[PDB]
C-alpha cells in the first residue's frame, strides 16, 4: 500500500 507520508502534500482521498 502507499505510504501517505512519502509526500505530505498529497491528499489520497482527493480525486
Amino acid at each position, epitope marked *: *500500500n*502507499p*505510504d501517505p*507520508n*512519502a*509526500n*505530505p*502534500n*498529497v*491528499d*489520497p*482521498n*482527493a*480525486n
Partner: antibody
Amino acid sequence: VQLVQSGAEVKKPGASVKVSCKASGYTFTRYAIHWVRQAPGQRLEWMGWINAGNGNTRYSQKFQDRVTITRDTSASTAYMELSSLRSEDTAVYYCALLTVITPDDAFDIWGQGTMVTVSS
Amino acid sequence: DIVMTQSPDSLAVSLGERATINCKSSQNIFFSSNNKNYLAWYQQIPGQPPKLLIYWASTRESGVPDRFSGSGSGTDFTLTISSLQAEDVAVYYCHQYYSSPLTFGGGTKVEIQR
C-alpha cells in the same frame, strides 16, 4: 505562489553549504517543502521534506548522515544544510512544493534552483 | 526503492507527429482502495525547474494543453503527446509518490525532426 532560493555558492570539499528557500503567495505553515537536486546531466534526486508547520522531517537514506532541513515560519523560509561535501555533490539544489494535491486545489511549484559547486 | 525506468531515452519526430514515452515502475503503484496510481509526469526545459504536467497518472494539471495525456495503471505507464509542437522540445520525467524515498525516472528527451 513562489519559492525564491539563495544564490549559487562554491564550497571546498569537506566544507558545508546552506541554501535558503523563501516562500511567498501562501500561508507558509500549510505545506511541506521538499529538497531535490539535479547533477549536470543526471536525473532528479529527492533529498527530504520538512513540514513547514510542525517542523517534522523525512530524509532520504543517501543524505541522512549529512543533511539537515529546517524552517523559520516567521521568515517563511526553509533551509537545507549539506555537510562533508564531495565533488559528487556539485549540482543544482531545488526547493519545491511537490505535488500539492488537496480537495479543491492541485499545484506544484519549484524554486529557481541554487547551483552549489564543490571546488577549491 | 521504486526504480522508474523510462523508454526510449531520446525521441525525435516531426512537427505534429505523435510522441510516446513509456515509464515502468519496479513495483506496483496502484492502490485498489481509491483506484489511484501515484505517478506524475514532469516537463523540463534547459535552465528551468521541472513543470508538472500530469498527476494521478492521467489528470492534467490546469493550463496544460490537452495534447498531453497520461495512461496506464500498476507498473506500466505512458505519456502521449498527440501532436508534437515546437515548444514541446524538453526532457520528460516520470515520478512516483507511492513510497519513500520519492523517485524520478531517468528522463526522455524529445526533439523535433525538421
